[PDB]
Write a protein that holds these residues in place. Structure first.
Motif, PDB file in Angstrom:
ATOM      1  N   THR A  37      -2.952   4.291  -1.301  1.00 28.70           N
ATOM      2  CA  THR A  37      -3.087   3.982  -2.719  1.00 28.70           C
ATOM      3  C   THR A  37      -2.629   2.555  -2.994  1.00 28.70           C
ATOM      4  OG1 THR A  37      -1.878   6.084  -2.796  1.00 28.70           O
ATOM      5  CG2 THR A  37      -3.067   5.497  -4.754  1.00 28.70           C
ATOM      6  N   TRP A  38      -3.514   1.761  -3.585  1.00 28.36           N
ATOM      7  CA  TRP A  38      -3.205   0.371  -3.892  1.00 28.36           C
ATOM      8  C   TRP A  38      -2.553   0.238  -5.264  1.00 28.36           C
ATOM      9  CZ3 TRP A  38      -1.775  -3.798  -2.000  1.00 28.36           C
ATOM     10  CH2 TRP A  38      -1.895  -5.026  -2.662  1.00 28.36           C
ATOM     11  N   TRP A  95       0.828  -1.200   0.000  1.00 24.33           N
ATOM     12  CA  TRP A  95       0.000   0.000   0.000  1.00 24.33           C
ATOM     13  C   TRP A  95       0.865   1.253   0.000  1.00 24.33           C
ATOM     14  CZ3 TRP A  95      -4.893   1.561  -0.676  1.00 24.33           C
ATOM     15  CH2 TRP A  95      -5.871   0.566  -0.806  1.00 24.33           C
ATOM     16  N   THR A  96       0.320   2.359  -0.506  1.00 20.94           N
ATOM     17  CA  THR A  96       1.075   3.609  -0.553  1.00 20.94           C
ATOM     18  C   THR A  96       0.358   4.709   0.217  1.00 20.94           C
ATOM     19  OG1 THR A  96       0.203   4.787  -2.488  1.00 20.94           O
ATOM     20  CG2 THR A  96       1.540   2.891  -2.953  1.00 20.94           C
TER      21      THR A  96
END
Length: 12
Positions: free
Chosen positions: A10-11, A2-3
């Motif tokens: 964000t994936w 993940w981000t």
């Protein structure tokens, strides 16, 4: 993984 950006995830 993940981000994390400015309180947002964000994936990819």
């Amino acid at each position: 993984s993940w981000t994390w950006e400015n309180g947002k995830w964000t994936w990819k």
